[PDB]
Amino acid sequence: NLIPTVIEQERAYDIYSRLLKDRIIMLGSAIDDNVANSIVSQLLFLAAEDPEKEISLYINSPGGSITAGMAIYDTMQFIKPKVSTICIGMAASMGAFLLAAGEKGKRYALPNSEVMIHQPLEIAAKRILLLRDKLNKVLAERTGQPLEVIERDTDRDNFKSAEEALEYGLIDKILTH
């Protein structure tokens, strides 16, 4: 499949570019180094264009490496714009982490979405241990849950409904309209 194109006023965007024009970032694939570079660059760009306005991040991702995901997370945190997050279909592993890392009150999920916070689905082990202790801690803080609940869910394939993700604290609202 190829991606459509639209023509606004007289410039021609491709579909995700037209989304980027209204400050929406589409994270819709597995998270690797190149995808992390892409998301980070889009965040830096939107933050540069208007540091005060809000950015949205749509997620439909099975996740990926914790290091790339943490790059994305730190970029969300440091930029002046606050980043809302939405779960389109599937937010797993680092995708789920990034969903829960959204601005409080502005993390969303569609009714038939699913969330799985399973963090993983040699010179670096200490740093992977350093990055693993941070993920559980941030999830605990962002969801109001105790750390021993988080560690228990980030170690198993526990799929959660949008209503379950709401009761867990991962999101703040289910979109219906």
Active site residues: 93, 118
7 is a contact residue toward a second copy (CB under 8 A): yes
Q: In the window 100-139, what residues touch other proteins (CB under 8 A)? A: 106, 108, 110
CA distance 47 to 58: 17
Note the Cα 6 to chain centre separation in Å.
26
CA distance 86 to 23: 13
- Residue from 12, 15, 44, 129 that binds other proteins (CB under 8 A)? 44
49 is a contact residue toward a second copy (CB under 8 A): yes
Q: In the window 11-40, what residues touch a second copy (CB under 8 A)? A: 11-22, 24, 26, 28-29, 33-38, 40
Q: Can you state the angle between helices 66-78 and 125-143, rounded to 10 degrees?
A: 50
Buried b (16+ CB within 10 A) or exposed e, 27-46: beebbeeebbebbbebbeeb
Measured from the CB atom, the residue of 97 and 108 that comes closer to other proteins is 108
CA distance 148 to 168: 14
Q: How far is CA 86 from CA 8, 124, 147, 148, in A?
A: 25, 31, 24, 26
- Please choose which of other proteins, a second copy, none residue 54 contacts, taking the beta carbon within 5 to 8 angstroms, the exact cut-off set by kind: other proteins
- Residue from 106, 145, 149, 161 that binds a second copy (CB under 8 A)? 161
172 is a contact residue toward a second copy (CB under 8 A): no
Q: How far is the CB of 124 from other proteins (least distance, A)?
A: 27
Q: Which positions lie near other proteins, rule CB under 8 A? A: 22-24, 44, 48, 54, 56, 58, 75, 78, 84-86, 88, 106, 108, 110, 175
